[PDB]
Amino acid sequence: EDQVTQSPEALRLQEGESSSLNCSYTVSGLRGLFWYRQDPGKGPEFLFTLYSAGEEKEKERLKATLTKKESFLHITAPKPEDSATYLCAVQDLGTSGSRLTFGEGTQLTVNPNIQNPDPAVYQLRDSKSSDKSVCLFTDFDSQTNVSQSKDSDVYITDKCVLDMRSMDFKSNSAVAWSNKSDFACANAFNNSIIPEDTFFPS
Amino acid sequence: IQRTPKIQVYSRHPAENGKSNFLNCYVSGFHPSDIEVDLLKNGERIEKVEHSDLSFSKDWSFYLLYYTEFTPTEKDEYACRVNHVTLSQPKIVKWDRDM
Amino acid sequence: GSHSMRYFYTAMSRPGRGEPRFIAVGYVDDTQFVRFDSDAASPRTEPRAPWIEQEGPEYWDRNTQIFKTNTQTYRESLRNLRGYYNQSEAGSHIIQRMYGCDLGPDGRLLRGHDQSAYDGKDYIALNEDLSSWTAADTAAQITQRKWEAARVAEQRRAYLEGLCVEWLRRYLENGKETLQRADPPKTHVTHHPVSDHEATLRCWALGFYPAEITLTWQRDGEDQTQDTELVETRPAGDRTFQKWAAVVVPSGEEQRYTCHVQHEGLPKPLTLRWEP
Amino acid sequence: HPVGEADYFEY
Amino acid sequence: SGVTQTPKHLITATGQRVTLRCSPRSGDLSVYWYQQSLDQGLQFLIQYYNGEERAKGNILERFSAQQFPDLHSELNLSSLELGDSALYFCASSARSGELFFGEGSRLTVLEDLKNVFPPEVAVFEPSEAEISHTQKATLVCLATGFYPDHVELSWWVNGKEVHSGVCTDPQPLKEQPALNDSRYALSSRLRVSATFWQNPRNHFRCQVQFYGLSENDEWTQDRAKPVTQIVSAEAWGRAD
Ligand SMILES: [Cl-]
Ligand SMILES: [Cl-]
Ligand code: NA
Ligand code: NA
Ligand code: NA
């Protein structure tokens, strides 16, 4: 009889684009509703608790509100660091103890803004081997998506944002390598829509 | 700390000489909860006697109803024997058709 | 108000190292509808009114699991309490608790209750505001700080304003032919002679529900509490109540005296007399 | 329906 | 948080038994056990208050737990199946009612431990073309052929772990996607200024912590027992 329904299960926001996370609940009597934040690998992190409809809790870009049927977690101007899973749980008055009935969560990914894109593919040689090599697609804008290879002998990682906070710089990059040598970096990301201005050195 | 029980012996329906009924013994106003209540037919223990569940009043004193289905006769004498920690010996309260 | 729902808990320790007993009874007005007794091999919550029987086995498990948990916690509490008052295991002690909601003359919550007693005396009580507590002594203040740190008051308010009220309204509808149908008292006056102070007049009220009734003897001058024997309201067993008030002493005559019955089941308060 | 006792609900 | 869980990682075989340890927050007297099955929510298993069992969720008969008088808990999972592979979380409740969770315990149950492999780690030095075009230098680390998925990749610059300018893939790649028991690969990037990479005194190491088979099982094979271990690869700054 204790059911917690979270929507959407997946949330794909652009950096700065505010969104509202829904948590529907059925309980005999509400003891309290909880919002947890969960990073991959780690344990749910306590955010705040709402007991009555009209109660509001605010911790940075997160604001939570309560009704007799649901709870909303409003995210204002999200940043890539807000990317995580947001968990909703409830404590029942009609049961014993402080146990929580969890919702399945809202997996959030905040697409970062890219200030000055400089799309380029570079070849990186191994620190030990001379033959062994990797292809790096880097400095592409927030709208370029890296496609997978149908070649089982080519590995293409997904996009990844690194923060050089010392220079207030953010950068996207994906890696490609092949089991067989004579692997061309100019063709390494041939399967994806690559920017017409992508830089390919000699 | 200890309160003496109030005992009332009476019938669920008016006293019908010959037709079937219920014999009630209502103990109230006592503390602690442990009490002995026995319904009697002519000085002997009535065989089959049920009771309500232990509950209490605003003053925390306990109350119970002990009861059995009986058929009253002219020459039938009925009584309730109650024993509490507050009582030295059990108290027999005879059933009166007028109380 | 108009209607109420109450739960009565009785937690009692056993003579020595014996396992304590936990009992709970639930009431809606004067009708008992549930019970739990921890003293059984496998204790289960049981129906006691015919209208609570329609409730699913989910309702009964919720009840049973709350009372099976209370059994374990009230045991810890009984030990905490004998520690406060520096009592040994030798004696037996009782924690009593009364909690519930009163619905309004309309049917919205009038006020909520949560009172506890230790060995038949008030110990801790939730105040009318459902936010603060009234502790009786320094030991009940140890319980208050425990209950403030555990946010007990807030969780009572949520229960009493919500859950308690919803379920009372639920039971009120399911049992409206019993709980919302006021039974008027079957009234009669009997004559019990004695020659010397002369005879005795007994005014009965029988088979009435709810328990609230008022019986007075008016020889005119008014209600006269001094020469009247008012026996307290008693249950008949069929979920109905009984009560009588008597007078002795015509000091005048038995026909001068008239009985007055006040009850909800009556369109107007009765004027009863002895009919020879 | 009775109220459930949460954790640390003891006298 | 304050709750501590051990082991953080466990790789065992089907039919075996495992014991998960939990210490509640200092001051908390209760322990709650939760299971988080891969791409599924937290499910209540069992709760203990002051060494005594209280509430019971859908904990299997095969599973057993208890809370010790020092308040710590142990959750034992016997006759292990592949489906018992999940994240096991313990939580301790505050006096005010909120639960606080530990890091969790990730159990991977396998039919046989023969397909368990440690990673090979390689560091790929920045492109000279990248240095000349951007004035930045990105080192790429590749952890490959590891099974199962339990890996923690860290970057160590001059003996100190770095978090700035780095991003490691959240999920590893199946090298042979159809295998179902496919070995994995994981990439990471560390970007530094061309200047930082330019002075040769600067040393860069890619650390990969593998959580393998340790102690719990026997190893009846040729190659070295794929034990829990750190595998690393390094590079030094180039004057160029
Ligand atoms: Cl959805
Ligand atoms: Cl429970
Ligand atoms: Na979705
Ligand atoms: Na006794
Ligand atoms: Na360990």
TrEMBL record, chain C:
<feature type="disulfide bond">
    <location>
        <begin position="101"/>
        <end position="164"/>
    </location>
</feature>
<keyword id="KW-0325">Glycoprotein</keyword>
<dbReference type="GO" id="GO:0031901">
    <property type="term" value="C:early endosome membrane"/>
</dbReference>
<keyword id="KW-0732">Signal</keyword>
<keyword id="KW-0472">Membrane</keyword>
<keyword id="KW-1133">Transmembrane helix</keyword>
<dbReference type="GO" id="GO:0009986">
    <property type="term" value="C:cell surface"/>
</dbReference>
<feature type="disulfide bond">
    <location>
        <begin position="203"/>
        <end position="259"/>
    </location>
</feature>
<dbReference type="GO" id="GO:0030670">
    <property type="term" value="C:phagocytic vesicle membrane"/>
</dbReference>
<dbReference type="GO" id="GO:0012507">
    <property type="term" value="C:ER to Golgi transport vesicle membrane"/>
</dbReference>
<keyword id="KW-1015">Disulfide bond</keyword>
<comment type="similarity">
    <text>Belongs to the MHC class I family.</text>
</comment>
<keyword id="KW-0812">Transmembrane</keyword>
<keyword id="KW-0391">Immunity</keyword>
<dbReference type="GO" id="GO:0098553">
    <property type="term" value="C:lumenal side of endoplasmic reticulum membrane"/>
</dbReference>
<feature type="domain" description="Ig-like">
    <location>
        <begin position="185"/>
        <end position="271"/>
    </location>
</feature>
<keyword id="KW-0490">MHC I</keyword>
<dbReference type="GO" id="GO:0055038">
    <property type="term" value="C:recycling endosome membrane"/>
</dbReference>
<dbReference type="GO" id="GO:0042612">
    <property type="term" value="C:MHC class I protein complex"/>
</dbReference>
<dbReference type="GO" id="GO:0006955">
    <property type="term" value="P:immune response"/>
</dbReference>
<dbReference type="GO" id="GO:0002474">
    <property type="term" value="P:antigen processing and presentation of peptide antigen via MHC class I"/>
</dbReference>
<dbReference type="GO" id="GO:0000139">
    <property type="term" value="C:Golgi membrane"/>
</dbReference>
<protein>
    <submittedName>
        <fullName>HLA-B*3507</fullName>
    </submittedName>
</protein>
